[PDB]
Design a protein around this ligand. Structure first.
Ligand SMILES: CO[C@@H]1[C@H](O)[C@H](n2cnc3c(=O)nc(N)[nH]c32)O[C@H]1COP(=O)(O)OP(=O)(O)OP(=O)(O)O
Ligand SMILES: [Mg+2]
Ligand SMILES: [Zn+2]
Ligand SMILES: [Zn+2]
Ligand SMILES: [Zn+2]
Ligand SMILES: [Zn+2]
Ligand SMILES: [Zn+2]
Ligand SMILES: [Zn+2]
Lengths: 576, 49, 93, 67, 82, 257, 8, 479, 87, 45, 44, 98, 115
């Protein structure tokens, strides 16, 4: 019915008016490309050949467009159509008369997409504003869109079968709009959290931590090669940190050439000892933490997620705030290229040697588990004798579960800490966790020491069978193993009952992901529809479509969210 | 005659039942094929439990 | 804080708590087409037709539906040609 | 379906060794001993012969499309 | 409105810069005269950028205040956001 | 500012293997020689197949691929042969290619193994390394395979079918003395076959002045070329590449000035 | 899969 | 023992039987995270291998068969009853877990191009097209014949030379996109000759015809099935996954010279990023690499049953130490480009890698001024129909956030469904307009002078007309 | 084309008058025939009216020379014998 | 019906859906393919 | 216009609009024979 | 025709009446790989609606030990609502109680 | 479908120059050499030999993109030396090294056989 057509989603009101299928759009699998800049995207030649951007013939560009017209559709840098002044369209594929090929001012030649053509890149779902960013086009000879790795974080895209949509603006006006509003370098900093959206990620973060250690010393030829990939190099080789006996540069010395202009920043490495700041060696840091950049030169410190990641006050954030968006784009790209070429010399890997720990550490983990199981048994015996006293506001079952969970969690965390103590400097799990590129201390602990308690619906594994978790366990068994505690690590391998309980926990995780996607989508749509028309007028009042004043000044101070920074008042706290 | 009943492949009432692997090859049917599906209108349909 | 405060100010601007739902949002005296895009659709249109409501066409969604330039950014202002400046300068072509 | 010429990783011709490998297995050599006798030394080459599944015999069981 | 009593921001907004550069570039593509001497620049958008730097774009921006009045700021009068 | 004078000792020389040590050479030169072994030594291999009848279970392009991978003896004729692009004649001629023809039909009840021996070449020098045999396909009774193929000169940079070597073993500094690789636990790592250290010491003491030298090689051949000939041809081809670069560079230098 | 306070 | 239960009434035959068919192919399942086993269960259904031994006889749509399937080097005991050895899906691949050039970052994979040239992960794609000669029409007969442009009033300019006399292309003829596989003609009733009814190849198929069959279907009409074969060499978009839930596309392909090489000369066939392992905690992958190294050297297929208690990492490590390798499986690698030893020692070992059905060639689509729908006069939908990608409501919200009003306008009006209507000034209802006659008149007012042209999306015109059919009057007034 | 280009500044919604429906509809006398086909294809005063819209992608509707693109379609009216509530 | 070519046969096209004069390439009809879109039993019902 | 037969593998020439049945076996599943024109396969 | 229709369409019922018909039965066998064929044949489908996001029918239950594969479930909108039998599981054919 | 032909990696298409020499404005006595249809093989040897020259202050090679086939070599020499001269001399030295290596490998071959 008419009401059925209009009412539902995919109806005329929403499925055909608010959103609709569009021309001049392309889609293909995305794959990485560290060599492309932040703003560049790699487009296959077939997608580039099908999509055409109409160019008006001017006295300036008549020769170039004439050559494109002569090439035709077959040769790649060609023109698919000619649009005359009358509006007549001459498709060049079917034979055009040699008279028709002649061009005059006012004709519109529809050239194939060429290098440097601004396009809009999208990945569904388009949750935030950074999910649609303008990319320059670079044509490369395979059939996948290729984008830089730093740009993956705004899109929330990884290269495991993902796909992205390419929209080509067809007019100079809309092309200028994209170029000056939505290009990738212009949206490095999000107004949502006044932090940079994009940061150094994956191999480059892991390797920048290693590159910036005090230990790293580079010889002459390696410095030559690293400087070769630096786009903004002045052409002057820095004086090596160690002139004699053999000229040897340092990783920080080369990274100082990457840092844009003169940027001053102080951040702390992840492994910074808390006592260091108060005690001596505060400035001459024993562990080479406390990153300090003065006059755009890395005086000291080990770079990590905190210094080069997506956080307020990062080196990239200070670069965007101080140097500008263009120099910051160059900064991102140069970090990636130089560090990735050093990683060929140094290399990274993950093996079983990383998971395995010392025999003493394994014995310590086993002892912690033994005494934890004994403690749980003691609590159970107290409960059976009714000696246990209920916690206020909780039933005896609830307080028994609380105490048992506390004991098991303390054992789990202590075993994790023992495993993390065992890790050597060379351990690669530790490299990735410390750099912040991937992983967490929890994952290391589960790999090496103890997987941990399996909880479903916020409780230990429930009694699915009559008064027992599995048929193999005795009825009314509240012990650690029966209710889901997985003593073995992933490296050690789970026992079969622990395997089933672990499967139950993982299933809860999967279900939570599936449900959260839908519910969050609905919430986001409702918020947008409620606040879509609110904007800052030229009075600087924030008014809706009805012109009712939502706010007299935007944010009550009339400032935009990206420019602002965290600061301390310093008059508030001190005593009189 | 009251009608025709579709036959699940390699069940007792199928032609392939109790045939040696060489004979299955002679009929151009794979010895390793599990069976358990109906061939309705030329496509193999599986009844999900 | 700007993004939180704006939502709180839109919900409590009218003086009654405006839920972000079909009821609260559609009850506000916006344009009928803008209400039509959110949830209720046809029913909103029927009511607007019955009462002779007129769409001001100041909203973003209403202009998007009719294909006109939105009143959003890059559409808030109208450019005009400056004849006197055109006359001045070096007109090479 | 058939033994690949030229082991993928390095390129040594391994296509001539399948029938000899099967024959050595019939001669009660262990698989490792047969691989050693055939001259396959790197684990990349041994992977080819050890993990190959000869389906072409099963395909040859079917009568030819044209006689 | 009168030329006096202009209350809008003197700085050119980002959206105004986008639309002014795009519109001027579209005019340049249609063979409009170019105020700024071009140093071998053929792309219309780049020529428009040069003109914007020289503040010679022949466009006056009309900013609509919410009360219905309008203020006409010439592109030259506005301070470039850059 | 002049080239080092290298030396060579050949420890092992067999029909399918050459082990040699290049000394007093830079690492870049040694690695480039290793690279030229793999990718820039010309060999003759099948690149054009016209299949007249293929009743085998394997489809036609499968057969073409397998035929291409079959090594062909190219010891001396490869230098005489010209690349198909260089040859003036249209398509292929005896100067620019070698014609192989294969006709096999299985009329016996027993399965017929089509082998490389069934490939017949018009030129005696180029033969599929037969003088077991590589199995192209197996044929049931009533199945026939007839095809005609031409072989062209090329090198491994185009396709791996033109790769002369099976595995090129490159190793320098067998006992870690320049500390190019930093072992987390030096003791666990197995000693190199070329290592000169006693069993007690896992690594040699670090030598700051030392630079990579005395590179160890082990080149294995597919039989397409003699293993000695692979090394000699690689050296000659790299020399030719450098000489072409020098000619073009002289042209550019003169033209600019 | 870790604990009651962590993740499943 | 220490008394736990003395009244056991039954015993499990083997705990590994709790897993299903797809989960039984995972080696060392107990050493993986649970979501990763769940993901591998779904990826294993999509892998490429010989699906059935009678695949030559069968004419199925979308059949992929791998050139050189290999059975796993590290296999579970329950795989034997799944017949995975008989019909394997995947190739054991020398895999290095390393960061080489940044092209393996995220989940992508660097593949060896020389190995790909030698037949590594090469597959064939068969597509079958079916057509039926239907004479059921009263005066319509869908005869099989080669259409002729002069004889048939309805025809298309795609190539018709391939078709033989019967109207079916002979097997062994190459077919490029937009070629006529089957030529069919419907005789046209002469109300007062031929509307073309040929079937055309899916774009970019670029295959060779394998088998052409002519039969009579269930209805008794002549039935023709044509199977087109396309070889599929792996590219830099194809998706490869291991048995431990690690999926990823091919970042780039380097030749054997460029790939890093061990001292023995072994270059990894696949290089995966070390960053995939830690967050996902798929340690089964690492243990499988170690056991595969030991198995390849020893010559016996490794046992990876889930719960064994006789196979430990330490035992596998000692076994590997016996064969002359580092006990944890690491190997000293050399950089292919420069020859210098990589300072870190890279973990190299054979690992069963699968090739999934998702390939970039099937997933690449581009649209520019294509056909439009009838109802909405908007671009079509789908890759087969050359449809444009949808600019959803979330996308328009992002563009509103940007402030790109004109890009939003182009994308939502000008690119999709531009249209013009004529609207009476006095009454907002649309008015009849004859452009050729140049007379524009509005019914209901008897007014001709006051009519204005309005540009609106065709979808908006349809919305307004559907409102009018519901007796709602959307009077659009320019004033 | 001669008509000036205008942009809608206000959309007025109202219930369509039955008299206005009668005047506006191109069909005169209503849709008298349930059948869509007369004289073979076109049925005047039927559901598929040539004056109502363009048919077959090549014809022109009677009211204007639409050619399947220019014509926006034209409404018709059915005069119900006895009135019916609108749902 | 190419205006410059009296009695000219216009070749159909599938890529954009238009009939094009083959001797000059003029596009006659812009998007005039669109989608381009049991009578035996009983009759009209 | 020579069709190979599935059941007995005997080529039978069939004219246009002729029933698809193989003489000497009666089977109704025919295969068109391989084309005479030859296709160049790169060994690559 | 009734049996053939119900198998081909996937709707369990009569042609005229689709109100009580249950869709999702009788799917086309997957032939991508032998593993896919085997898993498709050994598959269970819970009748709970996919649209409902209530999580109780989706969670793995303790009683599925050895009857249903814990790992193998589709990830997406049907997590836990489609299940595969374990290797040794055998559904009872049925017998008379006399 | 968009795969480049294999011969494109080493074959100059018509109108392409094997070497193009462009000076570097940033620093004195520096030239930037672009070699088309060449890979790390030639680049590494040339860079190493240039680094051995005492008068060469800077020498490095860069492949701008692995999918494309091009080498960029930057050479900076001291005054009284030209970057082009350094490049030519490097090539002569590499050729001399390879010729000496060929002679010695042939002698080693002849000695290993029948000796
Ligand atoms: C990271 O978030 C993404 C996005 O949110 C997007 N996405 C995916 N599915 C849906 C869906 O159904 N509905 C909506 N709206 N969005 C969806 O996909 C999510 C992750 O899913 P995953 O958790 O499987 O990603 P791995 O962690 O698995 O990545 P491996 O290691 O395989 O490469
Ligand atoms: Mg992903
Ligand atoms: Zn090998
Ligand atoms: Zn010739
Ligand atoms: Zn009117
Ligand atoms: Zn009309
Ligand atoms: Zn014409
Ligand atoms: Zn017959």
């Amino acid at each position: 019915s008419l009401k059925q057509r209009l009412k539902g989603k995919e109806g005329r009101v929403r499925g055909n008016l608010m959103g609709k299928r569009v021309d001049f759009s392309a889609r293909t699998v995305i794959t990485p490309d560290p060599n492309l800049s932040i703003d560049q995207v790699g487009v296959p030649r077939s997608i580039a050949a099908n999509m055409t951007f109409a160019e008006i013939v001017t006295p300036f560009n008549i020769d170039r467009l004439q050559e494109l017209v002569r090439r035709g559709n077959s040769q790649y840098p060609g023109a698919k159509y000619i649009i005359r002044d009358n509006g007549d369209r001459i498709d060049l594929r079917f034979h055009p008369k040699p008279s028709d090929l002649h061009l005059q001012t006012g004709y519109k030649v529809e050239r194939h997409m060429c290098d440097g053509d601004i396009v809009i890149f999208n990945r569904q779902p388009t949750l935030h504003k950074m999910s649609m960013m303008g990319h320059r086009v670079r044509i490369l000879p395979w059939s996948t869109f290729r984008l830089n790795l730093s740009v993956t974080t705004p899109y929330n895209a990884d290269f495991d079968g993902d796909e992205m949509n390419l929209h080509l603006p067809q007019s100079l006006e809309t092309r200028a709009e994209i170029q000056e509003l939505a290009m990738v370098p212009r949206m490095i900093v999000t107004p949502q959290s006044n932090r940079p959206v994009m940061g150094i990620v994956q191999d480059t973060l892991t390797a920048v931590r290693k590159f910036t250690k005090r230990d790293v010393f580079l010889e002459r030829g390696e410095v030559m090669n690293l400087l070769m990939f630096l786009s903004t190099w002045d052409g002057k080789v820095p004086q090596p940190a160690i002139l004699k006996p053999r000229p040897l540069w340092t990783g920080k010395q080369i990274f100082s050439l990457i840092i844009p202009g003169h940027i001053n920043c102080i951040r702390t490495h992840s492994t910074h000892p808390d006592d260091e700041d108060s005690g001596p060696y505060k400035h001459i840091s024993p562990g080479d933490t406390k990153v300090v950049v003065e006059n755009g030169e890395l005086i000291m410190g080990i770079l990590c997620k905190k210094s080069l990641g997506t956080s307020a006050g990062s080196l990239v954030h200070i670069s965007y705030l101080e140097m500008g968006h263009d120099i910051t784009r160059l900064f991102y790209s140069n970090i990636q290229t130089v560090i990735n070429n050093w990683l060929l010399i140094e290399g990274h890997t993950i093996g079983i040697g990383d998971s395995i720990a010392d025999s003493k550490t394994y014995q310590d983990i086993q002892n912690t588990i033994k005494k934890a199981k004994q403690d749980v048994i003691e609590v159970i015996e107290k409960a059976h004798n009714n000696e246990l006293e209920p916690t206020p506001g909780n039933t005896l079952r609830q307080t028994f579960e609380n105490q048992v969970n506390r004991i098991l969690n303390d054992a789990r965390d202590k075993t994790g800490s023992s495993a993390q103590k065992s890790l050597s400097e060379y351990n690669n799990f530790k490299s990735m966790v410390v750099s912040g590129a991937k992983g967490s201390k929890i994952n290391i602990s589960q790999v090496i020491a103890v997987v941990g308690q399996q909880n479903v619906e916020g409780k230990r594994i429930p009694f699915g069978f009559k008064h027992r978790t599995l048929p193999h366990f005795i009825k009314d068994d509240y012990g650690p193993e029966s209710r889901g505690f997985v003593e073995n690590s992933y490296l050690a391998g789970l026992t079969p009952t622990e395997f089933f309980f672990h499967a139950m926990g993982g299933r809860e995780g999967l279900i939570d992901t599936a449900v959260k996607t839908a519910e969050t989508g609905y919430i986001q749509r409702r918020l947008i529809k409620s606040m879509e028309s609110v904007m800052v007028k030229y009075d600087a009042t924030v008014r809706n479509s009805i012109n009712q004043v939502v706010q007299l000044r935007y944010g009550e101070d009339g400032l935009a969210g990206e420019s602002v920074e965290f600061q301390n008042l310093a008059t508030l706290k001190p005593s009189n | 005659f009251i009608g025709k009943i579709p036959i699940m492949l390699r069940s007792t009432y199928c032609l392939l039942n109790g045939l040696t692997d060489r004979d299955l090859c002679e009929l151009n049917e794979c010895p390793l094929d599990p069976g358990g599906y109906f061939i309705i209108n030329g496509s193999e349909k599986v009844l999900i439990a | 804080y700007r993004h939180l405060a704006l939502l709180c100010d839109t919900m409590t601007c009218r003086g009654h708590l405006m839920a972000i739902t079909r009821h609260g949002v559609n009850r506000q005296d916006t344009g009928p087409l803008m209400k039509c895009s959110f949830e209720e659709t046809v029913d909103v249109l029927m009511e607007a037709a019955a009462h002779g409501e007129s769409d001001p066409m100041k909203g973003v969604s209403e202009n998007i539906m009719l294909g006109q330039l939105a009143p959003a950014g890059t559409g808030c202002f109208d450019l005009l040609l400056d004849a006197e400046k055109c006359k001045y300068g070096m007109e090479i072509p | 379906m058939i033994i690949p010429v030229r082991c993928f990783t390095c390129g040594k011709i391994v296509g001539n060794k399948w029938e000899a490998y099967l024959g050595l297995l019939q001669a009660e050599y262990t698989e490792g001993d047969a691989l050693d006798a055939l001259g396959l030394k790197r684990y990349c080459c041994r992977r080819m012969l050890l993990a190959h599944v000869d389906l072409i015999e099963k395909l040859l069981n079917y009568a030819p499309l044209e006689k | 409105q009168a030329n006096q009593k202009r209350i809008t921001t003197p700085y050119m907004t980002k959206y105004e810069r986008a639309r002014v550069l795009g519109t001027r570039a579209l005019q340049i593509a249609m063979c409009a005269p170019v105020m700024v001497e071009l140093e071998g620049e053929t792309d219309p958008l780049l020529i428009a950028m040069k003109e914007l730097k020289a503040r010679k774009i022949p466009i006056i921006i009309r900013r609509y205040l919410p009360d219905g009045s309008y203020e006409d700021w010439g592109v030259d009068e506005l301070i470039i956001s850059d | 500012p002049y080239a080092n004078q290298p030396t060579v000792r050949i420890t092992e020389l067999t029909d399918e293997n050459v082990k040699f040590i290049i000394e007093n050479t830079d690492l870049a030169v040694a690695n480039s020689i290793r690279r030229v072994f793999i990718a820039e030594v010309p060999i003759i291999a099948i690149d054009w197949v016209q299949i007249d009848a293929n009743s085998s279970v394997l489809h036609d392009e499968f057969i073409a691929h397998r035929l291409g991978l079959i090594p062909l003896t190219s010891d001396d004729i490869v230098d005489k042969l010209q690349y198909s692009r260089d040859c003036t004649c249209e398509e292929f001629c005896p100067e620019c290619s070698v014609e192989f023809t294969l006709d096999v039909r299985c009329n016996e009840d027993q399965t017929r193994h089509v082998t490389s021996r069934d490939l017949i070449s018009n030129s005696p020098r180029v033969i599929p390394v037969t003088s077991d045999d590589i199995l192209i396909v197996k044929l049931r009774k009533g199945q026939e395979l007839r095809l005609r193929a031409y072989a062209k000169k090329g090198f491994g940079k185009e396709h791996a079918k033109w790769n002369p070597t099976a595995g090129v073993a490159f190793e320098y500094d067998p006992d870690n003395a320049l500390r190019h690789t930093v072992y987390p636990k030096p003791e666990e790592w197995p000693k190199s076959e070329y290592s000169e250290l006693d069993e007690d010491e896992s690594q040699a003491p670090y030598d700051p002045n030392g630079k990579p030298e005395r590179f160890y090689y082990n080149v294995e051949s597919c039989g397409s070329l003699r293993p000695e000939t692979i090394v000699l041809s690689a050296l000659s081809g790299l020399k030719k590449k450098l000489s072409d670069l020098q000619t073009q560079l002289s042209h550019e230098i003169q033209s600019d000035v | 899969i870790w604990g009651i306070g962590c993740n499943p | 023992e220490v008394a736990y239960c003395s009244t056991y009434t039954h015993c499990e035959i083997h705990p590994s039987m709790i897993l299903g068919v797809c989960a039984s192919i995972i080696p060392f399942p107990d050493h993986n995270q649970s979501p990763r086993n769940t993901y591998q269960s779904a990826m294993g259904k999509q892998a490429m291998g010989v699906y059935i031994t009678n695949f030559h006889v069968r004419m199925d749509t979308l059949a992929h068969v791998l050139y050189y399937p290999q059975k796993p080097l590290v296999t579970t005991r329950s795989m034997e009853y799944l017949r995975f050895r008989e019909l394997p899906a995947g190739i054991n691949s020398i895999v290095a877990i390393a960061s080489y050039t940044g092209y393996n970052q995220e989940d992508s994979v660097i593949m060896n191009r020389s190995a790909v040239d030698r037949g590594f992960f090469r597959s064939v794609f068969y597509r079958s097209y079916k057509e039926q000669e239907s004479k059921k029409g009263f005066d319509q007969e869908e005869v099989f014949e080669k259409p002729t442009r002069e004889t048939c009033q309805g025809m298309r300019h795609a190539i018709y030379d391939k078709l033989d006399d019967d109207g079916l292309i002979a097997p062994g003829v190459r077919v490029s996109g937009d070629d006529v596989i089957i030529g069919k003609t419907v005789t046209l009733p002469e109300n007062e000759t031929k509307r073309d009814c040929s079937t055309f190849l899916r774009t970019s198929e670029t295959g060779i015809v394998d088998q052409v069959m002519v039969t009579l279907n269930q209805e008794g009409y002549k039935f023709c099935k044509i199977r087109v074969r396309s070889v599929r060499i792996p590219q830099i978009g194809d998706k490869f996954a291991s048995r431990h839930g690690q999926k990823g596309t091919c970042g780039i392909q380097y030749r054997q010279e460029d790939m890093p090489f061990t001292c023995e000369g072994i270059t990894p066939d696949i290089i995966i990023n070390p960053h995939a392992i830690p967050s996902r905690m798929t340690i089964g992958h690492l243990i499988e690499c170690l056991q595969g190294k030991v198995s390849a050297n020893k010559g016996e297929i490794g046992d990876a049953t889930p719960f064994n208690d006789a196979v430990n990492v330490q035992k596998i490590s000692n076994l590997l130490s016996d064969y002359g390798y580092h006990l944890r499986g690491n190997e000293v690698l050399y950089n292919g480009f420069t020859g210098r030893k990589i300072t870190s020692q890279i973990f190299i070992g054979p690992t069963y890698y699968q090739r999934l059905k998702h390939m970039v060639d099937d997933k690449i689509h581009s649209r520019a001024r294509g056909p439009i729908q009838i109802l909405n006069r908007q671009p079509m939908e789908g890759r087969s129909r050359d449809g444009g990608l949808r600019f959803g409501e979330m996308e328009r919200d992002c563009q509103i956030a940007h402030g790109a009003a004109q890009f939003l306008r182009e994308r939502l009006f000008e690119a999709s469904d531009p249209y013009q209507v004529h609207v009476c000034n006095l009454c907002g209802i649309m008015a009849i307009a004859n452009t050729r006659t140049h007379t524009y008149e509005c019914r209901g007012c008897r007014n001709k002078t006051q009519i204005s042209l309005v540009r609106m999306p065709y979808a908006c015109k349809l919305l307004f007309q559907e409102l009018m059919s519901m007796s709602i009057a959307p009077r659009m007034m320019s004033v | 084309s001669a008509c000036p280009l205008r942009t809608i500044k206000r959309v007025q919604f109202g219930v369509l008058s039955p008299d206005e429906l009668k005047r506006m509809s191109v069909t005169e006398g209503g849709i008298k025939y349930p059948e869509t086909t007369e004289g073979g294809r076109p049925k005047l005063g039927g559901l598929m009216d040539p004056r109502q819209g363009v048919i077959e992608r090549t014809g022109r509707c009677q009211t204007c020379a639409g050619n399947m693109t220019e014509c926006p379609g034209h409404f018709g009216h059915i005069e119900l014998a006895k009135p019916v509530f609108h749902v | 019906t190419c205006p410059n070519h009296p009695d000219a046969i216009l070749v159909e096209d599938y890529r954009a859906g238009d009939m094009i004069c083959p001797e000059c390439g003029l596009v006659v009809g812009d998007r005039v393919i669109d989608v381009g879109s049991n009578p035996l039993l009983s009759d009209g019902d | 216009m020579i069709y190979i037969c599935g059941e007995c593998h005997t080529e039978n020439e069939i004219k246009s609009r002729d029933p698809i049945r193989c003489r000497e076996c009666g089977y109704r599943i025919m295969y068109k024979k391989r084309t005479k024109r030859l296709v160049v396969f790169d060994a690559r | 025709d009734g049996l053939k229709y119900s198998l081909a369409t996937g709707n369990w019922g009569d042609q005229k009446k689709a109100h009580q018909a249950r869709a999702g039965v009788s799917q086309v066998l997957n032939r991508l790989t032998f593993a896919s064929t085997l898993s498709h044949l050994r598959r269970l489908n819970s009748p709970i609606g996919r649209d409902g996001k209530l999580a109780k029918p989706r969670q793995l239950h303790n009683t599925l030990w050895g009857m249903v594969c814990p790992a193998e479930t589709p990830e997406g909108h049907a997590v836990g609502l489609v299940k595969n039998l374990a290797l040794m599981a055998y559904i009872s054919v049925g017998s008379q109680p006399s | 479908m968009n795969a480049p032909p294999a011969f494109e990696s080493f074959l100059l298409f018509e109108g392409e120059k094997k070497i193009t020499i462009n000076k570097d404005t940033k620093v004195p006595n520096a030239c930037l050499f672009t070699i088309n249809k060449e890979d790390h093989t030639l680049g590494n040897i040339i860079k190493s030999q240039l680094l051995k020259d005492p008068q060469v202050l800077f020498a490095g090679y860069k492949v701008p993109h692995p999918l494309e086939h091009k080498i960029i070599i930057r050479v900076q020499t001291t005054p009284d030396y030209s970057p082009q001269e350094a490049f030519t001399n490097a090539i002569t030295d590499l050729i001399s090294e390879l010729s000496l290596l060929e002679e010695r490998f042939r002698v080693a071959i002849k000695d290993k056989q029948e000796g």
